[PDB]
Design a protein around this ligand. Structure first.
Ligand code: MG
Length: 905
DNA sequence: CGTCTTATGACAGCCGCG
DNA sequence: GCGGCTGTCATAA
């Protein structure tokens, strides 16, 4: 009923807009938008417009956008500030939609497609589009259909029609295993020549023009190829037809290495899912191929084919088309799980930006703050250029490398946004400065009180207490939204453990899963039904609860990063509200806050245990403290606990009823000390970690900063059915560590924390024996391939050449001259294996594209010359040496006087 | 989109050192 | 041979 935009675009003096109207139909505008900009004026000229500092401004209405834009630059030639929203697209959206936008996703045309191109030359470069497009699968969210465009005849072979009957059948019948739930949604259309296929695709494109266009590498491959191929056959004008406003532009992306070209389609928002994944998944992956991510996300994988992909359409055209359809579907399957598109939509409409601007936190916040200031008749300052300057960040405590038996951790909730709100940090709320004492003096409360009238930060900054800042006001809206979605997420997590516990002792019956909302804790009535439920329907409930959890994670993690990005933007020279005073004010307050409460926790627990000077806090990073619970348990005596859950319950109550109130009054005192606007430093308990009761097992260990492992029984309110390992920083968490090595090192840790030294020594022995029999990919290292050309000296390694780069140059020599094997792509990742000396390849290592097997033309030699000893030492033994040294254990039993006896019975 | 931030670790190349 | 130094790549916040 209320109308909303789809895409907005500026072309010359006109604004081009696609939108849904009051009746719910998609329409297009061409508006000659008249933009306003502002200039400072004297006190006499009474207006309603004021800048953020309170100074008056006069309004300048322009005849067109060209006039407004060129008024800005000649204001600089005089040397005067040109105020207001210079991005006229954002100005238009704000005027046209001066209310909270409530959109309808069912009316937004979201499309994802993928292309197939047969190429014997090697990789088909989008910039050249030298080879025919032989397949296109295009999914439309409004129709809910997969549109398949098949080429029967090309210079690379004539093929028969694709059979949907064969596609549906299982591999064991000679079928393709195309998921049954999409079979009835496939609209198939074969073509005699490329020109007919490409011409009908454009007609289809006009009839159903995408608003959000997505897919896997659509921006870097699919879109450019379809654009350039149409251009080369039909002409530039016909290629422009992919744009609703017939306007396209080649955009050049250049970073600290090389450059690449993409194609901007005006009037369409392109959200490449590979980029949504990298931004919002919070995972670093060894490979970013669709087959690899699909396997990680959905535990599926694809049916394997014989021969190279360049010969696939020839040998097996049936599978060729089927795989293309499947690939278009898995993006949708990943989105069903992660929900990054819905996230992007909610975010973009809230900020009132082009949907693709979700990739730019600076644009996002610049729009949010502008809209907030516009409501109050206030005028935003001009964007000014600044030199890049370093500034201090968080505090990280230097831990003593040791094992730690009983550990309990605490985190500050939304630290940086909370500091902003507590101290009232904002551009227009700066009051002044005070003489700053050493940071240590504020921590112990020995320094004099900074101000009696203003809200202070230990970096020397003072802020107004009565005035509410734009930044604190707009951040408040976001943090309360995170509290809700994290609440849903944690309840889904808690509900998951109840079900996991029910899978241990199930009841074999024929029933269905219970219809419940997993975002809320199960009631007693639902719990008793779960106990009498079948393992089949329990596994379905578990799948659904975890899927609800993942949906909760996505939402809360995105709000987390967007809020932290506001702090981050303050330290970025391009942000309209760039201010290192405000940036440092935040980080210095945090530094004091962490170290302050460390002192308080140490004081409290010493009084509680009847001792003095004992160091209870062992570690901290930014907003967290890790407390040694050894003494707390010892004061009671661990003989008084009947099982593991007993002492976990005890520390839980100790934290909630004793430590947290003591923490609250500590921070409350600090609030008075800094004279802050409001007390918002709240600390929740996170981990309760320790060994199983009665077992050998070290519970946890630290090796250094950002590197530790814990055996966690309870995390932030969720009581695990089985203890989960919390490992931070260690090699098991790095995408560069081989897959099999990660798994082995994790088991090493698990045995250390839960079972003890003798168990570790046992597993080491067995892994060391069966090491050589592991899949070569699973034991291969991963690294990013940057600056290959920089170290390439006539095919051979130059000075200071990194290990993985040495591998690539070896690979390139091995595949040199032969028509085309898989090529290593600049900027992407590679597998790395060490080679034994004397190998037919030039060097001590080899590298090839990750997520793939090496060429069969070189595979057997690599396997034969693999250096297993160097690989075991570098990737497995050396890291395990690190863990065991820290924990004061041996992974290998040291020589003893006992060796001079015979213990074999 | 290509204009969120700092802190901090491991590891390999190069090179000194009778 | 190992330790200092720097480049590179990765993570924790
Ligand atoms: Mg494809």
């Amino acid at each position: 009923m209320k109308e909303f935009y789809l895409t907005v675009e500026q072309i010359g003096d006109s604004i081009f807009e696609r939108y849904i109207d009051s009746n719910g139909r998609e329409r297009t505008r061409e508006v000659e938008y008249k933009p306003s900009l502002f200039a400072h004026c004297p006190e006499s000229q009474a207006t309603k417009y004021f800048d953020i500092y309170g100074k008056p401004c006069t309004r300048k209405l322009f005849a067109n956008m060209r006039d407004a834009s060129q008024w800005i630059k000649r204001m600089e030639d005089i040397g005067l500030e040109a105020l207001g929203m210079d991005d006229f697209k954002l100005a238009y959206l704000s005027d046209t939609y001066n209310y909270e936008i409530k959109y309808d996703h069912t009316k937004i045309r979201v499309a994802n497609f993928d292309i197939e191109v047969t190429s014997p030359d090697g990789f088909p470069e989008p910039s050249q589009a030298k080879h025919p497009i032989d397949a296109i699968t295009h999914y439309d969210s409004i129709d809910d259909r997969f549109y398949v465009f098949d080429l029967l005849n090309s210079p690379y072979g004539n093929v028969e029609e694709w059979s949907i009957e064969i596609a549906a059948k299982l591999q064991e019948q000679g079928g393709d295993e195309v998921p049954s739930e999409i079979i009835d949604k496939i609209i198939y259309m074969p073509f005699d020549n490329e020109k007919e296929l490409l011409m009908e695709y454009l007609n289809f494109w006009q009839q159903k023009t995408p608003v959000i266009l997505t897919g896997w590498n659509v921006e870097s491959f699919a879109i450019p190829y379809v654009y350039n191929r149409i251009k080369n056959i039909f002409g530039e004008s016909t290629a422009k037809r992919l744009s609703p406003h017939r306007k396209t532009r080649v955009k050049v992306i250049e970073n600290m290495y090389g450059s690449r070209e993409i194609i901007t389609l005006f009037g369409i928002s392109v959200l490449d899912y590979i980029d949504l994944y990298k931004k919002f998944s919070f995972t670093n992956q060894p490979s970013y191929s669709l087959d690899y991510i699909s396997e990680f996300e959905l535990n599926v994988g694809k049916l394997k084919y014989d021969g190279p992909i360049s010969k696939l359409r020839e040998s097996n055209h049936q599978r060729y088309i089927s795989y293309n359809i499947i690939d278009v579907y898995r993006v949708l399957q990943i989105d069903a799980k992660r929900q990054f598109i819905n996230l992007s939509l909610d975010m973009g409409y809230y900020a009132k930006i082009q949907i693709q601007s979700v990739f730019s936190p600076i644009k996002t916040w610049d729009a949010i703050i502008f809209n907030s200031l516009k409501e109050q008749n206030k005028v935003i300052p001009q964007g000014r250029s600044h030199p890049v300057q370093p500034y201090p960040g968080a505090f990280v405590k230097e831990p003593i490398p040791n094992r730690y038996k009983y550990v309990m951790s605490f985190d500050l909730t939304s630290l940086y946004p909370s500091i902003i709100r507590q101290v009232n940090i904002s551009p227009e709320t700066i009051a002044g400065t005070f003489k700053v004492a050493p940071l240590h003096d504020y921590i112990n409360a020995v320094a004099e009180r900074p101000s009696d009238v203003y809200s202070c930060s230990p970096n020397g900054m003072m802020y107004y207490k009565d005035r509410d800042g734009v930044v604190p006001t707009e951040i408040t809206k976001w943090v309360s939204q995170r509290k809700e979605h994290k609440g849903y997420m944690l309840a889904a997590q808690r509900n998951g453990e109840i079900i996991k516990e029910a899978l241990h002792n199930p009841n074999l019956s024929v029933d269905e899963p219970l219809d419940v909302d997993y975002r809320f804790d199960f009631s007693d009535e639902i719990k008793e039904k779960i106990k009498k439920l079948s393992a089949k329907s329990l596994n379905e409930m578990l799948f659904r609860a975890q899927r609800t959890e993942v949906a909760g994670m996505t939402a809360q993690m995105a709000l987390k990063v967007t809020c932290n990005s506001l702090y981050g933007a303050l330290g970025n020279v391009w942000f309209r509200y760039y201010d290192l005073r405000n940036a440092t004010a935040i980080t210095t307050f945090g530094q004091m806050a962490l170290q302050w409460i460390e002192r308080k926790v140490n004081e409290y627990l010493n009084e509680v245990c009847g001792t003095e000077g004992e160091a209870f806090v062992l570690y901290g990073d930014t907003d967290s403290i890790y407390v040694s619970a050894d003494k707390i348990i010892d004061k009671v005596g661990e003989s008084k606990f009947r099982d593991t859950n007993h002492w976990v319950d005890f520390l839980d109550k100790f934290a909630r009823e004793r430590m947290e109130p003591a923490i609250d009054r500590g921070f409350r005192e600090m609030c008075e000390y800094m004279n802050n606007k409001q007390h918002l430093m709240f600390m929740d308990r996170e981990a309760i970690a320790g060994p199983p009761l009665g077992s050998k097992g070290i519970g946890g260990f630290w090796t250094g900063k950002k590197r530790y492992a814990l055996n966690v029984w309870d995390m932030e309110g969720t009581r695990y059915a089985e203890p989960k390992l919390k490992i931070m920083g260690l090699e098991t968490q790095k995408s560069s560590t081989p897959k099999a090595v990660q798994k082995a090192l994790k088991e090493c840790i698990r045995r250390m924390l839960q079972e003890g030294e003798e168990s570790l020594q046992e597993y080491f022995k067995e892994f060391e024996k069966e090491f050589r029999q592991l899949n070569y990919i699973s034991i291969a290292s991963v690294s990013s391939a940057n600056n290959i050309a920089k170290y390439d000296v006539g095919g051979f390694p130059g000075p200071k050449c990194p290990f993985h780069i040495r591998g690539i140059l070896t690979y390139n020599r091995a595949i040199k001259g032969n028509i085309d094997a898989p090529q290593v792509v600049e900027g992407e990742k590679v597998y790395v294996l060490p080679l034994r000396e004397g190998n037919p390849f030039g060097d001590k290592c080899i590298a090839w594209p990750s997520g793939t097997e090496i060429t069969d033309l070189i595979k057997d030699d690599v396997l034969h010359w693999m250096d297993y000893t160097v690989l075991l030492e570098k990737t497995f033994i050396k890291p395990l040496e690190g863990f065991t040294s820290a924990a004061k254990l041996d992974y290998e039993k040291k020589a003893s006087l006992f060796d001079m006896f015979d213990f074999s019975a």
